[PDB]
Design a protein around this ligand. Structure first.
Ligand SMILES: CC(C)CC[C@@H](O)[C@](C)(O)[C@H]1CC[C@@]2(O)C3=CC(=O)[C@@H]4C[C@@H](O)[C@@H](O)C[C@]4(C)[C@H]3CC[C@]12C
Lengths: 78, 236, 87
DNA sequence: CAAGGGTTCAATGCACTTGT
DNA sequence: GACAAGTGCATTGAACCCTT
């Protein structure tokens, strides 16, 4: 029923602390697992919605953080 | 999500071996009965072939772990009740969906029409339905061997050490559980499979009574049912 | 005036003319893949999805219909020229 | 069963190479 | 060159599995 708090896509439930879609779930997992750092090619205020969330990895990750996603909730690879 | 002991696999192995060891009657026996280059012909073959089937079924039963631990009284008790029900598992294995017929050990296909002629017209419509149901079941030779074993140590009336057999059976019942638990992800469907299989037991009980009624409705038609069969199925 | 060259299919930033239509890399690749496989898609909605950056990933049937409607030429995807007899 | 951890892998799309 | 067609492959995310 819920919406992803990051992008507005249909949430599949809570993930890593926040209501979020499979997209943002999968993205946050891969970012934390690999310990990736991104660089915005704009002004670090890019639009992150259901339409253009894939345009800026830095801004998508920062928005996961601001929404309340917890790096600690991401477990070791199994 | 465990595997199986050595016993278990030695048994499964063993059972899969005896099964092929006895699926058909020897080349000489088969040759002797099938000699020949009028409603007594289909009748003779069907009845004569059944006497071979039963024999094989009996010997297989003795090649079973724990069987010799049974009182001769019980042994003839278990065997006497299983004879007709296993013979059922074995007609399923030689059923051909393409022709809806049963294939005798001499490679001949017997249709619902042949069983008519021989006066077995009563037993066939149901026997063939059970085959179609065992077909879509799609079972492997382990199942079939294990299942068979089970049927044999199935609780029967007249049993002296009833509680004994129950366990001699609990083993095979258990082995089957495991083998199914490995062959597929020990997931939900794992029981669903174990169940449909154990269900074969109850259907095999209905086809057993029909075989008996056929023996009856045959003695009554004054038609010599081999003494051997009349004896083993308690056909009065 | 022209602040951004627009993909005629989805409205994403167009990278150039692909198979005779101003399209993004996403729609270019989707169209080429759809044509080379001769893919037949089945919309699981109402057979009338408006294409954007969200819906383009959601409905392959309507995206392909939009690619054609915009003027993408399927005959221009790996035609039988000398270069193809190569690979 | 549901939730929220996990994983998978075909489709995707960015960056590239090839041909004119 | 600059463009458009073709290619390589890392990333995406819908659909699963697993444990509480
Ligand atoms: C009353 C009694 C005679 C009736 C029994 C009938 O209804 C049955 C069940 O229909 C009988 C008739 C003949 C029959 O004994 C057989 C012939 C074979 O050739 C073979 C011999 C041997 O390879 C068996 O492992 C399988 C099979 C196909 C058996 C199965 C049971 C059959 C098919």
């Amino acid at each position: 029923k819920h919406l992803c708090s990051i992008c507005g896509d249909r949430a599949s439930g809570k993930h890593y602390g926040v209501y979020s879609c499979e997209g943002c779930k999968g993205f946050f997992k891969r970012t934390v697992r690999k310990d990736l750092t991104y660089a915005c090619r704009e002004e670090r205020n890019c639009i992150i919605d259901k339409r253009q969330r894939n345009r800026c990895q830095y801004c998508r990750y920062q928005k996961c953080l601001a929404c309340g996603m917890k790096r600690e909730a991401v477990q070791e690879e199994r | 999500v465990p595997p199986l002991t050595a016993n278990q696999k030695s048994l499964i192995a063993r059972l899969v071996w005896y099964q092929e060891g006895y699926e058909q009657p020897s080349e000489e026996d088969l040759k002797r009965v099938t000699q020949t280059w009028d409603s007594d012909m289909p009748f003779r073959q069907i009845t004569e072939m059944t006497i071979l089937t039963v024999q094989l079924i009996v010997e297989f039963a003795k090649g079973l772990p724990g069987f010799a631990k049974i009182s001769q009284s019980d042994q003839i008790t278990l065997l006497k009740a299983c004879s007709s029900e296993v013979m059922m598992l074995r007609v399923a294995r030689r059923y051909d969906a393409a022709t809806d017929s049963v294939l005798f050990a001499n490679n001949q296909a017997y249709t619902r029409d042949n069983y008519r002629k021989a006066g077995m017209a009563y037993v066939i419509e149901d026997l063939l339905h059970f085959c179609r149901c065992m077909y879509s079941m799609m079972m492997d030779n382990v199942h079939y061997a294990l299942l068979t074993a089970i049927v044999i140590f199935s609780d029967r009336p007249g049993l002296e050490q009833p509680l004994l057999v129950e366990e001699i059976q609990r083993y095979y019942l258990n082995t089957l559980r495991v083998y199914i638990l490995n062959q597929n992800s020990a997931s939900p469907r794992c029981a669903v499979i174990f169940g449909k299989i154990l269900g074969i037991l109850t259907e095999i009980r209905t086809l057993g009574m029909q075989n008996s009624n056929m023996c009856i409705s045959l003695k009554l038609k004054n038609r010599k049912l081999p003494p051997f069969l009349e004896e083993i199925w308690d056909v009065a | 005036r022209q602040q951004e060259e627009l993909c005629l299919v989805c409205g994403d930033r167009a990278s150039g003319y692909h198979y005779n239509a101003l399209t993004c890399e996403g729609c270019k690749g989707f169209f080429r893949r759809s044509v080379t496989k001769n893919a037949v898609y089945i919309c699981k909605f109402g057979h009338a999805c408006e294409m954007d950056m969200y819906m383009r990933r959601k409905c392959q049937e309507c995206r392909l219909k939009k690619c054609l409607a915009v003027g993408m030429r399927p005959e221009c995807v790996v035609p039988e020229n000398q270069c193809a007899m190569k690979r």
